[PDB]
């Protein structure tokens, strides 16, 4: 096969139709399912795969207690075809408490991070073998996207960060060819803090929308040039901001270049993508905590920072039901590149005390040019019944 190039135009999008759901927590109450968090979806030429960071335990297990910690030596990247739940036959593709994966049109690249907080290692595993590695450069939790990397002509790109993720000091974009790290660019432009990027091919380049845990409730943008490794960055202009926490829509504001300084601290992994001057984006329906999930278009919301004219709203998860991380992934159609997204549906500790574990299920949606209706597709497990 040839390498992927994503050179088709982005599809027409009117909204998102339902595509997949794993039901992992409901199945966990009567079968051996893995504890996971920080899921994502990525596709090869033929199929989509679901990924997640396992906690090295099944849910109905003694080891599922205290699974709220994000970093332990036992976390591994699980990989399945999308919609096969994480049962005991699941492959652990690498040791990882942070990760990213993508298929270049010939083989899978996994970027797998593990080790001491002060001295972590990233392994670059390509076509099933370890090809390269890099050590923590700022010695304070090296970390990556928790979603798919993007490859154009076999050059895969991954955003990675260390320290408090400040700017050129801490965030680097690694350019990778068949698992070998061939180039490394410092972050450049006006994005101050950049974590957990959701990235998509935007031929000839890659575009990423990320998390700002310090200053923005607006989201950073990175444009990555694949041909000359140059980096540019800014923020999603939209006056309807997409992080959590954030201010109410009646009082929020945004800036194209700067963090908005409104509930700037903390965040959640999320996504947005341009549609000409409009932006499509998803966020938790609640402004302070990860409850519900909605997507909408903001008219001129990519270009105009005072715009709050939303249209084409969809509830994905009703405002009373838990959500979590969400991320984009791109799927090649016959004539255009479609944008799809997934939502992590986190259940258990800290917020729910019926259970000793923390785990997620997922729901997945794909962009459509057709029509679509309404629903709400939450996790749906009853923790009162599978109670400890």
């Amino acid at each position, epitope marked *: 096969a040839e390498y992927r190039n994503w050179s088709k135009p982005q599809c027409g999008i009117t909204g998102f139709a339902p595509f997949s759901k794993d039901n992992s927590i409901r199945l966990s109450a009567g079968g051996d399912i893995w504890v996971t968090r920080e899921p994502y979806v990525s596709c090869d030429l033929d199929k989509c795969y679901q990924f997640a960071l396992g906690q090295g335990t099944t849910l109905n297990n003694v080891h599922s207690n205290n699974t709220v910690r*994000d970093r332990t030596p036992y976390r591994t990247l699980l990989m399945n075809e999308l919609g096969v739940p994480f049962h005991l036959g699941t492959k652990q593709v690498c040791i990882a408490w942070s990760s990213s994966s993508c298929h270049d049109g010939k083989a899978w690249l996994h970027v797998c991070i593990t080790g001491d907080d002060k001295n972590a290692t990233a392994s670059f595993i390509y076509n099933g073998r370890l090809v390269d590695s890099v050590v923590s450069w700022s010695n304070d939790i090296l970390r990556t996207q928790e979603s798919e990397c993007v490859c154009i002509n076999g050059t895969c790109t991954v955003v990675m960060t260390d320290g408090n993720a400040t700017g050129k000091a801490d965030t680097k974009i690694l350019f990778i060819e068949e698992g070998k790290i061939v180039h490394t660019s410092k972050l450049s432009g006006s994005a101050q803090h950049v974590e957990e990027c959701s990235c998509y091919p935007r031929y000839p380049g890659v575009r990423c929308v990320c998390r700002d845990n310090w200053k923005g409730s607006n989201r950073p943008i990175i444009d990555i040039n694949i041909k000359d490794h140059s980096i540019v960055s800014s923020y999603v202009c939209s006056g309807l901001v997409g992080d959590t926490p954030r201010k109410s829509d009646s009082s929020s504001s945004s800036h194209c270049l700067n963090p908005n300084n409104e509930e700037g601290g903390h965040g959640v992994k999320g996504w947005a993508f341009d549609d000409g001057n409009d932006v499509w984006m998803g966020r938790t329906i609640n402004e302070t905590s990860r409850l519900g999930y909605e997507t909408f278009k903001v008219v001129e919301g990519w270009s105009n920072p005072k715009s709050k004219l939303q249209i084409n709203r969809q509830v994905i998860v009703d405002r009373g039901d838990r959500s979590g991380y969400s991320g984009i992934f791109s799927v090649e159609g016959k004539s255009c590149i479609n944008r799809c997204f997934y939502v992590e549906l986190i259940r258990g500790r800290k917020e729910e005390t019926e259970v000793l574990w923390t785990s997620n299920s997922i729901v997945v949606f794909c962009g459509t040019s057709g029509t679509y209706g309404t629903g709400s597709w939450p996790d749906g497990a009853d923790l009162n019944l599978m109670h400890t």
Partner: antibody, heavy 127, light 109 residues
């Protein structure tokens, strides 16, 4: 837990101070070691702290570039070094244990409150 | 940055009487809220954490209550020890771990 600090200081402006805090042995494996200051009638302010096991340090936005916090396990002594001392840095500096002992890169910090405190070191910044 | 604020700035009370100190947060801090007592010329002393859990050695006359944006510390009967400055502090999710500017509890003439 006992925390014992260095005696009082007077420093010229533009210089640096290095307050010390000696703990009960093994404190830096159980608690974050935190520095908090109090300008003499103004209010308490957190400066930063150093987290157990990994020993990574975290600083309040206004002190970044000006403060360093380090800890020697062997003497079980933590140090706070504050630099480019302005007259406004005249304060009592306390070390304290925070119950917080793990930073979740997604979910932040639990239990960052202060059960045990040092006796406080007065630092005066004057000509 | 969450702003803690306290009222009243000074609370004048008769010895043996009940006192209530109010602390209000500019955003929801769940129950991630602590109270400290500071006497003149001493380090602060933790009284309450989780908005309501009494810390070790703290006598039962201290009681904390509230959630979200509003909290109370109740001192059920002021003994001569209890005339001090009281600080609230949030510890909700993310720094800075801001303190209130403190309330003085003061003997009525």
């Amino acid at each position: 837990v006992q925390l014992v600090q260095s005696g009082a200081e007077v420093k010229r402006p533009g210089s640096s101070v290095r307050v010390s805090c000696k703990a009960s042995e093994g404190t830096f494996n159980k608690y974050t070691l935190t520095w908090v200051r109090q300008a003499p009638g103004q209010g308490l302010e957190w400066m930063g702290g150093i987290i157990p096991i990994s020993g990574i340090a975290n600083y309040a936005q206004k002190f970044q570039g000006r403060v360093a916090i380090t800890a020697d396990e062997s003497t079980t002594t933590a140090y706070m070094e504050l630099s480019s001392l302005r007259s406004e840095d005249s304060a009592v500096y306390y070390c304290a244990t925070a119950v917080s002992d793990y930073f979740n890169r997604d979910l932040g910090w639990e239990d960052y409150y202060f059960p045990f405190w040092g006796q406080g070191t007065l630092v005066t910044v004057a000509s | 940055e969450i702003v803690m604020t306290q009222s009243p700035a000074t609370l004048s009370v008769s010895p043996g009487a009940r006192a209530t100190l109010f602390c209000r947060a500019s955003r929801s801090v769940s129950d991630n809220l602590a109270w400290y007592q500071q006497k003149p010329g001493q380090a602060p002393r933790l009284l309450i954490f989780g908005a309501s859990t009494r810390a070790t050695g703290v006598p039962a006359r201290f009681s904390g209550s509230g959630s979200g944006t509003q909290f109370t510390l109740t001192i059920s009967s002021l003994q001569s020890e209890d005339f001090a400055v009281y600080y609230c502090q949030h510890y909700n999710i993310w720094p800075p771990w801001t303190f209130g500017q403190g309330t003085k509890v003061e003997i009525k003439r």
